[PDB]
Write an enzyme that holds these catalytic residues in place. Structure first.
Site, mmCIF file in Angstrom:
data_model
loop_
_atom_site.group_PDB
_atom_site.id
_atom_site.type_symbol
_atom_site.label_atom_id
_atom_site.label_comp_id
_atom_site.label_asym_id
_atom_site.label_seq_id
_atom_site.Cartn_x
_atom_site.Cartn_y
_atom_site.Cartn_z
ATOM 1 N NE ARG A 14 2.335 0.773 3.602
ATOM 2 C CZ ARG A 14 3.419 0.022 3.715
ATOM 3 N NH1 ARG A 14 3.573 -0.758 4.778
ATOM 4 N NH2 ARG A 14 4.305 -0.005 2.733
ATOM 5 C CB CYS A 17 -0.982 0.053 1.195
ATOM 6 S SG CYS A 17 -1.987 1.554 1.347
ATOM 7 C CD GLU A 30 -5.761 2.589 -6.954
ATOM 8 O OE1 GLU A 30 -6.228 1.469 -6.694
ATOM 9 O OE2 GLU A 30 -5.886 3.597 -6.194
ATOM 10 C CD1 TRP A 35 -7.083 9.226 -2.056
ATOM 11 C CD2 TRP A 35 -8.230 9.430 -0.106
ATOM 12 N NE1 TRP A 35 -6.223 9.749 -1.121
ATOM 13 C CE2 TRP A 35 -6.847 9.894 0.068
ATOM 14 C CE3 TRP A 35 -9.107 9.505 0.980
ATOM 15 C CZ2 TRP A 35 -6.382 10.390 1.301
ATOM 16 C CZ3 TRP A 35 -8.624 9.987 2.208
ATOM 17 C CH2 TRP A 35 -7.299 10.438 2.356
HETATM 18 C C1 HEM Z 1 -6.605 6.492 1.691
HETATM 19 C C2 HEM Z 1 -6.364 6.401 0.397
HETATM 20 C C3 HEM Z 1 -5.548 5.293 -0.144
HETATM 21 C C4 HEM Z 1 -4.790 5.322 -1.377
HETATM 22 C C5 HEM Z 1 -4.595 6.426 -2.401
HETATM 23 C C6 HEM Z 1 -4.251 3.926 -1.337
HETATM 24 C C7 HEM Z 1 -3.459 3.481 -2.433
HETATM 25 C C8 HEM Z 1 -3.287 2.080 -2.774
HETATM 26 C C9 HEM Z 1 -2.862 1.641 -4.121
HETATM 27 C C10 HEM Z 1 -2.635 2.480 -5.361
HETATM 28 C C11 HEM Z 1 -2.684 0.178 -3.986
HETATM 29 C C12 HEM Z 1 -2.280 -0.796 -5.076
HETATM 30 C C13 HEM Z 1 -3.635 -1.275 -5.596
HETATM 31 C C14 HEM Z 1 -3.602 -2.151 -6.841
HETATM 32 O O1 HEM Z 1 -2.708 -2.041 -7.700
HETATM 33 O O2 HEM Z 1 -4.520 -2.974 -7.005
HETATM 34 C C15 HEM Z 1 -3.013 -0.158 -2.570
HETATM 35 C C16 HEM Z 1 -2.870 -1.509 -2.016
HETATM 36 C C17 HEM Z 1 -3.316 -1.903 -0.716
HETATM 37 N N1 HEM Z 1 -3.859 -1.005 0.144
HETATM 38 FE FE1 HEM Z 1 -3.948 1.109 0.122
HETATM 39 N N2 HEM Z 1 -4.580 3.073 -0.327
HETATM 40 C C18 HEM Z 1 -5.328 3.925 0.423
HETATM 41 C C19 HEM Z 1 -6.024 3.507 1.623
HETATM 42 C C20 HEM Z 1 -6.043 2.157 2.156
HETATM 43 C C21 HEM Z 1 -6.850 1.757 3.340
HETATM 44 C C22 HEM Z 1 -7.826 2.580 4.170
HETATM 45 C C23 HEM Z 1 -6.475 0.339 3.530
HETATM 46 C C24 HEM Z 1 -7.000 -0.555 4.597
HETATM 47 C C25 HEM Z 1 -7.423 -0.009 5.724
HETATM 48 C C26 HEM Z 1 -5.514 -0.049 2.460
HETATM 49 C C27 HEM Z 1 -4.854 -1.352 2.338
HETATM 50 C C28 HEM Z 1 -4.187 -1.836 1.141
HETATM 51 C C29 HEM Z 1 -3.973 -3.290 0.966
HETATM 52 C C30 HEM Z 1 -4.294 -4.451 1.917
HETATM 53 C C31 HEM Z 1 -3.342 -3.340 -0.355
HETATM 54 C C32 HEM Z 1 -2.844 -4.548 -1.134
HETATM 55 C C33 HEM Z 1 -3.906 -5.235 -1.944
HETATM 56 C C34 HEM Z 1 -3.377 -6.546 -2.428
HETATM 57 O O3 HEM Z 1 -2.385 -7.037 -1.844
HETATM 58 O O4 HEM Z 1 -3.972 -7.092 -3.395
HETATM 59 N N3 HEM Z 1 -5.306 1.053 1.548
HETATM 60 N N4 HEM Z 1 -3.439 0.997 -1.812
HETATM 61 N N1 H38 Z 2 -7.038 3.022 -3.658
HETATM 62 C C1 H38 Z 2 -7.379 1.752 -3.439
HETATM 63 N N2 H38 Z 2 -6.915 0.793 -4.236
HETATM 64 C C2 H38 Z 2 -6.755 -0.523 -3.858
HETATM 65 C C3 H38 Z 2 -6.309 -0.904 -2.572
HETATM 66 C C4 H38 Z 2 -6.182 -2.243 -2.262
HETATM 67 C C5 H38 Z 2 -6.458 -3.213 -3.220
HETATM 68 C C6 H38 Z 2 -6.922 -2.866 -4.479
HETATM 69 C C7 H38 Z 2 -7.210 -3.905 -5.498
HETATM 70 C C8 H38 Z 2 -8.199 -3.771 -6.498
HETATM 71 C C9 H38 Z 2 -8.396 -4.759 -7.486
HETATM 72 C C10 H38 Z 2 -7.574 -5.881 -7.459
HETATM 73 C C11 H38 Z 2 -6.558 -5.999 -6.478
HETATM 74 N N3 H38 Z 2 -5.706 -7.053 -6.365
HETATM 75 C C12 H38 Z 2 -5.400 -7.951 -7.305
HETATM 76 N N4 H38 Z 2 -5.723 -7.800 -8.592
HETATM 77 C C13 H38 Z 2 -4.632 -9.152 -6.875
HETATM 78 C C14 H38 Z 2 -3.921 -9.497 -5.730
HETATM 79 C C15 H38 Z 2 -3.331 -10.770 -5.814
HETATM 80 C C16 H38 Z 2 -3.547 -11.460 -7.009
HETATM 81 S S1 H38 Z 2 -4.522 -10.432 -8.017
HETATM 82 C C17 H38 Z 2 -6.386 -5.006 -5.514
HETATM 83 C C18 H38 Z 2 -7.070 -1.516 -4.792
HETATM 84 C C19 H38 Z 2 -8.239 1.374 -2.273
HETATM 85 C C20 H38 Z 2 -9.203 0.417 -2.059
HETATM 86 C C21 H38 Z 2 -9.643 0.474 -0.737
HETATM 87 C C22 H38 Z 2 -9.052 1.407 0.110
HETATM 88 S S2 H38 Z 2 -7.887 2.266 -0.839
#
Ligand code: HEM
Ligand code: H38
Ligand code: HEM
Ligand code: H38
Ligand code: H4B
Ligand code: H4B
Ligand code: ZN
Lengths: 411, 407
Positions: A111, A108, A285, A280
């Site tokens: 953070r 993320c 994305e 947000w």
């Molecule tokens: C507040 C605004 C936020 C922005 C701009 C942000 C941004 C992002 C972005 C750009 C990704 C990569 C997503 C992707 O390529 O699919 C990400 C991943 C992640 N974010 Fe954040 N985030 C934010 C808030 C949060 C919040 C509130 C949480 C949980 C409380 C969170 C937990 C995670 C997790 C668990 C991943 C990894 C998802 C995965 O492993 O598939 N994010 N975030």
């Molecule tokens: N900005 C965001 N983007 C975000 C954050 C965390 C996860 C994702 C997201 C969306 C679609 C797909 C995935 N992950 C995957 N495609 C995979 C993970 C592992 C294998 S595929 C992650 C997107 C947020 C969502 C909720 C709070 S912030």
């Protein structure tokens, strides 16, 4: 043991010691790096060590480590585990747990914002209808008329793994996809499989390019139930470009609230299988992945055509050119409608500052470079030049299998 | 044991077995991933020689043959006696090609078997090294039609008698820190540009001044030599649409030729082994021109483009970056100098990976280095899982000579 990371642009060196509090595995060994691999019930036996370690972290953070209150909480959780094979978190522990899972999320980039997270405790929920109501309130509070606020809603924890709460949707708000019999897809190709399930479960599909999917909600290990989010609650933004007037005629829009609902929150060995969280969007994305991935809406071609680019050879960089225009459009649209959004330059710079701060205050910041570096313009953002250490801390967000693959249908 | 890698854009899954022949270490453990980190005796020697000869005779379908065994015996005796050994020409050629084949950070490996090897193991002086290097440059440049090559100087002995090319590349532009305060030319080369002066170079004190070669034979103090300018093919940079572009006055050299790495074949160390191929366009346009600590011309280009530089969210850096890269590709192509775009090269690499999975059982690859520094997710490599591990023969880094050599 001490570990250093270097920034190759600024020559700043930081020292990681936090990696020493690291539990779970990476997927890597001495002989293999699995750095780019996307995906690399408990007994009392394993539960009490995880409970204790969590409560030790908790009581340190509140400066009460070793206190009477600390010891009694230990003994009480202990008793409750040995008596019921599980335990309940207090409110305050839950809140701290949820914040830290976010803080520990090494993939993320957002953070910097970890300490401001609205936690909704939905651990009294017993039915799908209850889940729907909690989610609606989540979506309304998070949206806040365009001024997005981070939040998570936490449903009851797993018990025997036969009574799971799940949100079948991968995100609370997402567009349908319909594979046509000619092989083409209408709407979002990512969501074709889920869309079909929904249709199966009784959803009448509008069958357009931008149909908000219904919520599919499982409570207490029961079969899931369909619900429509009230459209007044779904904030959406029409996509236009500040200089290209034909852009609006592409017919694109996107929703403002990204809210991930398929992950698992682990706190002190407890498993929260439904914990939708929302924040947000970073502009890329939508404009890079959602629109320009070959396996998504894939609008690069049409945008390039309309820009009359030379498309006869890749070395013209027509793909690269269209991609930037689309991303300019996404940021312009969101900002003009006053919906919170962050560009990748600003998001990555904020993250560098967070990371340094985390090394100073905490002794490290686990981070996954492969995920933190934006999917365009990599090296002109400061993260590209930053060495990063990746390791897993708890509390944490984990993946879990898709529920349709595991669910036992009661019928 | 058997490991899978998935492409998330195509669903293609490959099984990797080649990693179980991995010999060196990655930097990572079960508990920490170091994927993003830039730099993580007679006894020692015989296993190393044996492992290498075993793969050599296996590649030529002669594993466990008289000629195989006889060679194993021969190298054994030479080790027992001399405490080192010499590779046969054929083994040398094989070692070098495979060092390239095994470079996990190299996107251009589809070409690995078309490598011209120049055996310079009979070299004894810097003047000799200079001559070998000029011939390498002329051969590889080939009037713009670039050909891969490597020149191999004598292997290390007691580490007292080392051959080194002090330059990090054969052809780089000078860097001078100015009384004003900033930097003239290339900031990456500032320290080296001064070591050359501290050795006697008379710098033309311009932006694109080709650096003098600084060559060290047999552990001796190194010596300065100018590459004949007629051997240094350069490209004036202009835009297919923006006529003001040429006014920035940009040029780049056509021949990338890495000269500071150590080549390891069957436990033998070749510490001077300059090698060259050709550019992927983004190496110059994204990294050389736009890196903050490099020529850093983004701001300048954005201006001439009349972009809104008021706010990062106009993506003015992004817009400029693309035009700069269009211009590099266009200039090279117009001048018939070999260059590859990141779309083409990554597509080639996917094709290569696939070839290696079936023909070899895998392909070590470092995702952090293989994904280009712009337009990452619109290239196929972005969606490709890769496993990274270290096979021999290999190229390795080595400390900068000046931190080691005694004068
Ligand atoms: C507040 C605004 C936020 C922005 C701009 C942000 C941004 C992002 C972005 C750009 C990704 C990569 C997503 C992707 O390529 O699919 C990400 C991943 C992640 N974010 Fe954040 N985030 C934010 C808030 C949060 C919040 C509130 C949480 C949980 C409380 C969170 C937990 C995670 C997790 C668990 C991943 C990894 C998802 C995965 O492993 O598939 N994010 N975030
Ligand atoms: N900005 C965001 N983007 C975000 C954050 C965390 C996860 C994702 C997201 C969306 C679609 C797909 C995935 N992950 C995957 N495609 C995979 C993970 C592992 C294998 S595929 C992650 C997107 C947020 C969502 C909720 C709070 S912030
Ligand atoms: C034929 C044209 C070639 C192209 C387009 C190509 C492309 C690349 C690129 C883009 C990189 C990353 C460079 C950076 O960011 O600094 C790279 C790294 C590498 N290449 Fe290739 N390459 C080619 C030929 C070769 C040859 C002939 C060799 C050796 C025989 C080689 C060995 C390597 C090594 C050892 C690295 C990374 C070194 C390190 O770990 O820092 N390449 N190459
Ligand atoms: N940036 C580095 N190395 C570096 C610096 C400058 C150039 C290169 C390099 C290496 C191999 C290939 C290339 N690019 C090329 N197209 C070729 C050079 C030689 C044959 S192909 C550049 C590599 C570092 C590694 C660890 C710390 S800094
Ligand atoms: C810290 C980080 O590993 C470093 O900046 C890397 C990232 N990826 C790279 N990739 C390539 N091809 N070349 C590089 O120099 C780098 N630099
Ligand atoms: C194979 C590779 O790990 C995969 O395609 C990753 C690469 N980096 C990513 N980075 C982000 N932020 N999101 C992603 O979905 C991906 N996909
Ligand atoms: Zn690793």
């Amino acid at each position: 043991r001490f570990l250093k990371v270097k920034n190759w642009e600024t020559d700043v060196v930081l020292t990681d010691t936090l990696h020493l509090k690291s539990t779970l595995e990476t997927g890597c060994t001495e002989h293999i790096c699995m750095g780019s691999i996307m995906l690399p019930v408990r007994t009392k036996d394993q539960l009490f060590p995880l409970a204790k370690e969590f409560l030790d972290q908790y009581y340190s953070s509140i400066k009460r480590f070793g206190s009477k209150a600390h010891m009694d909480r230990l003994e009480e959780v202990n008793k409750e585990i040995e008596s019921t094979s599980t335990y309940q978190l207090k409110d305050t522990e839950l809140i701290y747990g949820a914040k830290h899972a976010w803080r520990n999320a090494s993939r993320c980039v957002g953070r910097i914002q970890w300490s401001k997270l609205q936690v909704f405790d939905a651990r009294d929920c017993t039915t799908a209808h209850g889940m729907f109501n909690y989610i609606c309130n989540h979506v309304k509070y998070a949206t806040n008329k365009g001024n997005l606020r981070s939040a998570i809603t936490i449903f009851p924890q797993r018990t025997d793994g036969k009574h799971d709460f799940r949100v079948w949707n991968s995100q609370l708000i997402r567009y349908a996809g319909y594979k046509q019999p000619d092989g083409s897809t209408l709407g979002d190709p990512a969501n074709v499989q889920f869309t079909e399930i929904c249709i199966q479960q009784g959803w009448k599909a509008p069958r357009g390019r931008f149909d908000v999917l219904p919520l599919l909600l499982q409570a207490n290990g029961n079969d899931p139930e369909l619900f429509q989010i009230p459209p007044e609650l779904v904030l959406e933004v029409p996509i236009r470009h500040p200089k290209f007037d034909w852009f609006k005629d592409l017919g694109l829009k996107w929703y403002g609230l990204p809210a991930v609902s398929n992950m698992l929150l682990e706190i002190g060995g407890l498993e929260f299988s439904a914990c939708p969280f929302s924040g947000w969007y970073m502009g890329t994305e939508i404009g890079v992945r959602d629109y320009c991935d070959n396996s998504r809406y894939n609008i690069l071609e049409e945008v390039a055509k309309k820009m009359d680019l030379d498309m006869r050879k890749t070395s013209s960089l027509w793909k690269d050119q269209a991609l930037v225009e689309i991303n300019i459009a996404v940021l312009y649209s969101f900002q003009s409608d006053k919906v919170t959004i962050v560009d990748h330059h600003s998001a990555t710079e904020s993250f560098i500052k967070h990371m340094e701060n985390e090394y100073r205050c905490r002794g490290g910041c686990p981070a996954d470079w492969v995920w933190i570096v934006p999917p365009m313009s990599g090296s002109i953002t400061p993260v590209f030049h930053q060495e990063m250490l990746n390791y897993r801390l708890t509390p944490s967000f984990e993946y879990q299998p898709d529920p349709w693959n595991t669910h036992v249908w009661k019928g």
